[PDB]
Amino acid sequence: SQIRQNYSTEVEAAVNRLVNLYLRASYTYLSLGFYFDRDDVALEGVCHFFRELAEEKREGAERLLKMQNQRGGRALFQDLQKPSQDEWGTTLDAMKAAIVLEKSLNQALLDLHALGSAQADPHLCDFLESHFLDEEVKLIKKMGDHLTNIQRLVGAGCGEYCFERLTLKHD
Amino acid sequence: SQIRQNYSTEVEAAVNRLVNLYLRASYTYLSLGFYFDRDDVALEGVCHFFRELAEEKREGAERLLKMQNQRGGRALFQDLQKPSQDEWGTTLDAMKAAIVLEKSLNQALLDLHALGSAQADPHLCDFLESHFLDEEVKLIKKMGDHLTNIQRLVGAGCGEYCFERLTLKHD
Amino acid sequence: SQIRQNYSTEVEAAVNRLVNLYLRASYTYLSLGFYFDRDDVALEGVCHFFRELAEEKREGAERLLKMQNQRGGRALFQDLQKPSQDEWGTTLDAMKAAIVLEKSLNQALLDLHALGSAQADPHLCDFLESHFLDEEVKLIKKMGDHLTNIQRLVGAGCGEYCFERLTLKHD
Amino acid sequence: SQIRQNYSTEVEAAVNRLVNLYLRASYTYLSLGFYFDRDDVALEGVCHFFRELAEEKREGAERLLKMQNQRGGRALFQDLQKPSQDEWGTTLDAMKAAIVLEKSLNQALLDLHALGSAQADPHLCDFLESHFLDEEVKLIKKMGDHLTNIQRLVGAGCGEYCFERLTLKHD
Amino acid sequence: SQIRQNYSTEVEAAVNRLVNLYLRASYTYLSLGFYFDRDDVALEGVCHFFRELAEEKREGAERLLKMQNQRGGRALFQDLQKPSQDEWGTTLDAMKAAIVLEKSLNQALLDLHALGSAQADPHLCDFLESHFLDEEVKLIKKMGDHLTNIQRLVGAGCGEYCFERLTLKHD
Ligand SMILES: [Cl-]
Ligand SMILES: [Cl-]
Ligand SMILES: [Cl-]
Ligand SMILES: [Cl-]
Ligand SMILES: [Cl-]
């Protein structure tokens, strides 16, 4: 206001839309987590994996909102749509839906970076580089690793997984 | 006697019957535990799960007996029937019998709560709320989680369980 | 006022009356305690037992007054009548008067609980369940235990008491 | 089964009967303990003495059941009869009933030892020698010491007890 | 010699034969252990299980030899036959051979106990009771537990084992 400098209306609006997308993603992971806590599903480590991602996505939204105020833009909140499913199937189904969700967030980050670069907004571009882009690359790599392991188990694959788990040193 | 106040004969008798039910349940879990210690059954974690429940059910009976004396009622003991089976089958069979047993205890708790509420006995009602009702809900949820996991193993289910156990973080 | 919600005028008034009853009980225990400190009575453990109950009853009144303000009611104080006796007799006499007093408090608590339940005031009902009803049951049980022991001493009773005290392990 | 060696059917059955006797004794001590917790009885050290014996007798039953499985026999549970009394009288009455109960357990242990010796089962005989026979001799000696002291108090006896308790060094 | 008392020539000779049997058993477990260390067998936990039993059997022989000298008998050593097999098959085969071996040791212990009892040699009988008979019962029970678990794995059995291992608390 008194502080705003080199901060376009286009970036301000796109940051508000990205907050909605991150809060939507948090809501989707809340739903995924409670589905795996059902007594007829009962996969605690899958519950915990998704409930932690709910926290991460809400914290990403909060960092964007902090940045919006640091730049002198104004936070505007919209309705948050419910998640796409009420029940999430198997661990494989859920992990495939999570990779699709993370791809969509990553594309929105890349699109906002491109808008910042077009607007000659290096603070915005560095903010996304430093706090979001590598977090998404690392998370998508982990989900792809998980998908391969789940697929080799729900199809000699059982054997190779167990050897790697129970004989070889790993984190 | 000198102390009894707002404590109906109906509640006193129903507490003595519930002590018998809890001691019966303890006896049933003692039997379940030693069956899984047989050399031809030999599932130590299943033995330990049921022997711990024997302890919990006897401690529930002792808390009811303490409360009976705190209210000025008189403990009356009856014969304790032996458990329904001498041999308990598979872990799945045993877990299904345990859920049936816990449902029966929970219904007896709910029936005693309803009698206390009809008798306008808020101490009795709070005693059951505070020390029994949530213990039963949590235990039945755990047994239902176990049942789902055993069923997915003794039927891609083997795979999904092992992934959750050996890759994902859990308690 | 700005905060009051689901808090009936009937409960508000009954809480003010119960504060008077608890402060009256505190006054009665103050008197009991100083009577047992007289040089011609001189039972220090009896003095200390009643002076501690004076503190407990004043703290009960203060918790009710805190709750009255938490709900948006208004504390109203009335005159406090002096205790029923100036001299309290023997330890047996005093313990019998204390059980009568505690019965009267317990009945007033049960009556207020019944009014809260009729008014559909679950906060009030839980407040009494959580902070008062079991405190009274435990205290009345202790006083009844003491009465039995005093009676077996001021009447083979002397023998059985001393054996339990001096040979057997107790708190 | 796969493990059973030198373990007669006669010993197996007699061990199951002795488990019933020990669980019956535990039940009797549970009843004794809660009777001395009544507000009209109110002898805490007597309550604690019997509640500890309930624990000891159930632990004896559990050690027999463990041994039954170590030898390849099969645990078989029967109905547990209620204790012989609902009310237990004075401390003297209760201690006399406890000595009768312990004599009956000791005789059953001695009878099982004799059967093991006749069957040339030295593991069984040593098991009873090492874990049961001296526990019973020591407990019966303690109960006899208590009986003499209670008798000298509920009959110069009061004097001699108090001197021993209050002047002379003892555990 | 100067010390020998109540120690029959029959017991002395039978102790020397039992030393040979224990050293033979140690040799058999040495062979079992190195077979499971072969690169074409490669079951480290099975190797370690049998190499520890080699140590236990040699220590049993040494305790018998110490006792022979404590009683004034004279240790006499004989040739030690090689183990019955050069290759030991699967873990199941090996565990079945180990139970047969332990049964044979247990029978030799029971036969020596019977000879000591016939010779009225209570030191010998207690020595075997205290240091050997329960060690054998516990080891045979463990081997029977292992056999049942191996059989349920090399035949829903895979499932029940994994649940007990990976969900339930065990030592
Ligand atoms: Cl929607
Ligand atoms: Cl029955
Ligand atoms: Cl007055
Ligand atoms: Cl009976
Ligand atoms: Cl040979």
From Swiss-Prot, chains A, B, C, D, E:
GO cellular component terms attached to this protein's record: autolysosome; autophagosome; cytoplasm; cytoplasmic vesicle; ferritin complex
Residues annotated as transmembrane: none
Highest taxon of source: Eukaryota
Chain residues that bind Fe cation: 52, 55-56, 59, 62
Tagged with keyword Membrane: no
A Pfam family annotated for this UniProt entry: Ferritin
Keywords: Acetylation, Cytoplasm, Cytoplasmic vesicle, Iron, Iron storage, Lysosome, Metal-binding
Chain spans, region Catalytic site for iron oxidation: 52-59
Gene Ontology MF, one: iron ion binding
Keyword Iron: yes
Signal sequence range: none
Subcellular location: Cytoplasmic vesicle, Autophagosome; Cytoplasm; Autolysosome
Gene Ontology BP annotations: intracellular iron ion homeostasis; iron ion transport
Disulfide-bonded cysteines: none
Positions of the Ferritin-like diiron domain: 5-154
InterPro entries, sorted: Ferritin (IPR001519), Ferritin-like (IPR012347), Ferritin-like_diiron (IPR009040), Ferritin-like_SF (IPR009078), Ferritin_CS (IPR014034), Ferritin_DPS_dom (IPR008331)
Its biological purpose: Stores iron in a soluble, non-toxic, readily available form. Important for iron homeostasis. Iron is taken up in the ferrous form and deposited as ferric hydroxides after oxidation. Also plays a role in delivery of iron to cells. Mediates iron uptake in capsule cells of the developing kidney. Delivery to lysosomes by the cargo receptor NCOA4 for autophagic degradation and release or iron.
Other known facts: In horse spleen the light chain is the major chain.
Family statement drawn from the similarity comment of this UniProt entry: Belongs to the ferritin family.
Subunit structure: Oligomer of 24 subunits. There are two types of subunits: L (light) chain and H (heavy) chain. The major chain can be light or heavy, depending on the species and tissue type. The functional molecule forms a roughly spherical shell with a diameter of 12 nm and contains a central cavity into which the insoluble mineral iron core is deposited. Interacts with NCOA4.
Protein's recorded name: Ferritin light chain
Lineage: Eukaryota, Metazoa, Chordata, Craniata, Vertebrata
